[PDB]
Amino acid sequence: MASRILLNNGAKMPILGLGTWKSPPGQVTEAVKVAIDVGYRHIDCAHVYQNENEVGVAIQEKLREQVVKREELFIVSKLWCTYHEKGLVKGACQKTLSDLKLDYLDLYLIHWPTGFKPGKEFFPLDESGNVVPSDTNILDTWAAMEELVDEGLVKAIGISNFNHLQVEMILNKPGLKYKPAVNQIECHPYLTQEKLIQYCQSKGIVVTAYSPLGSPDRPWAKPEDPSLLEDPRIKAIAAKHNKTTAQVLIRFPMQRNLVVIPKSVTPERIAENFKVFDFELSSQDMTTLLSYNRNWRVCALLSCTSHKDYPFHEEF
Ligand SMILES: NC(=O)c1ccc[n+]([C@@H]2O[C@H](COP(=O)([O-])OP(=O)(O)OC[C@H]3O[C@@H](n4cnc5c(N)ncnc54)[C@H](OP(=O)(O)O)[C@@H]3O)[C@@H](O)[C@H]2O)c1
Ligand SMILES: NC(=O)[C@@H]1C[C@@]2(NC(=O)NC2=O)c2cc(F)ccc2O1
Incomplete structure (x- = not known):
């Protein structure tokens, strides 16, 4: 197991973040x-997590202490849904950079395919409680992401929570200048994503498992949802290997050639x-863990199921 995977922009990405x-x-x-301090060289961030300033304090202290060099770090952030307008993308990126106190990002992702009305609220609601969409489509948002590469603000661009037809839309975009380097999607033994992963990998897009x-x-x-960390079948595989259940759950996507965070x-x-x-x-272990799929999602973006670009109607 090599610690980095090569992206279609020519850069190497640490497979553990x-x-x-x-x-x-x-x-x-x-x-x-x-x-x-203990070896991580990839940090996954996002403006909507509201903690990028504090993440950046840590990165800056370890760069100043010369624990690590900037070129050895792989820092990822994501464009929130209320910034899909072409006019807002650069500013969103620059706010993230300022907060992380970086001069470039290694990877910047469109966080969801759904654009929302811009404004202070991250989930703008009408008076009936529906998320208010924006009319900007993913292809124009992608063109804005391409501009960030050409300005030196980001080394790579990608997508997150895109289904296969949305990935296809970007790949067939007229005038496409940079393919997405990464699609970051939920993935674990209860949501194994075999179809979407094969599609992306066949196109040279690296998949990150969230x-x-x-x-x-x-x-x-909820009490009644399936619990991977308590699943006796996964605990048994961990026991056989003298590792924790979390270590098995992390190693599993690694052996599918995924990045994991x-x-x-x-x-x-x-x-x-x-x-x-x-x-x-073992391969037997990998097949067995794949057999636990149940199409169970942590992140279903339930407030946005009528958005035209809601990703999870499509089978994959
Ligand atoms: N692109 C997107 O839309 C998207 C969506 C969801 C997630 N993500 C990214 O993916 C990351 C990981 O997903 P996640 O935060 O949803 O959940 P996760 O990584 O699957 O699970 C995190 C939880 O597991 C606990 N935990 C961690 N290591 C453990 C271990 N060794 N033993 C027992 N428990 C352990 C953590 O507890 P403690 O922290 O208390 O130790 C925390 O409660 C995110 O933080 C985010 O960066 C992206
Ligand atoms: N959806 C979200 O990103 C936040 C996450 C979180 N906010 C946060 O800082 N940690 C959390 O889990 C949060 C906490 C809550 F109690 C209720 C909603 C909620 O939503």
């Missing part, structure tokens, strides 16, 4: 500091989650 959604602003600076542990801290969790603010778990370069799941 630290996630930061739900990382409290008072804890994420230490979490990122610890992660860099919520690889099933996001036990998601705010809408487990979140933790717990220093011991940050370190444990990185220790996944000392063991191999």
Whole structure:
């Protein structure tokens, strides 16, 4: 297991990154500091997580301390839905850069295919509670993302939560200048994404697996949802390998040639989650873990099911 995967922009991406959604602003600076100390070289961020300033404090301290060089870090952020207008994309990117206190991003993603009315609210609502869409389509947002590359603000651009027909729309875009480098999508043994992953990989798009542990801290969790970390069948595979269940859940996407971004603010778990370069799941183990799919989603963006570009009506 090589630690980096080559992207279609010619850059190499660390296959293990630290996630930061739900990382409290008072804890994420230490979490990122610890992660860099123990080997992480990829951080997944987003403006909508509201903690990029604090992530950036950690990155800047470790660069100043010469723990790491900027070229060795792979920092990812995402354009929120209320900034899909061509006129707003550069400013959104520059706010993220200023907060992370970076002069470029390694990868900038369209966070969802759905554009929303611009304004202060991240989910603008009409008086009946529906998200108010914007009329800007993904192809024009993609052209705006391409401009960021040509201005030196980002080294790579990509997409997130795009279904196969939306990926296809970008790939067939008239005048397409840069293909997406990455599609970041939810992926774990209960949502194995075999069709979308094969589609993307056949097109040279690298897939990043989010919520690889099933996001036990998601705010809408219910007692009765399936729990990957407690699943006896996955615990048994971990036991056989003398690893934790989380380590198996992280190694699993790695062996599918995916990038994976487990979140933790717990220093011991940050370190444990990185220790996944000392063991191999068998092909039998991989097939068995794939057999647990149930099309169960952590992130279904339920407030936006009537948006024209809602991604999860389509089978994949
Ligand atoms: N593109 C998108 O739309 C999108 C959507 C969702 C997620 N993401 C990205 O993907 C990242 C990861 O997904 P996620 O945050 O939803 O969930 P996750 O990484 O599947 O799970 C995070 C949860 O697992 C816990 N945990 C971490 N390591 C553990 C271990 N070794 N043992 C037991 N529990 C462990 C964490 O607890 P502690 O933190 O308390 O340790 C936290 O409660 C995000 O943070 C974000 O960066 C992107
Ligand atoms: N959807 C979201 O991104 C936030 C996440 C979160 N906000 C946050 O900082 N950690 C969280 O889990 C949150 C917490 C809640 F209690 C209720 C909604 C909610 O939604």
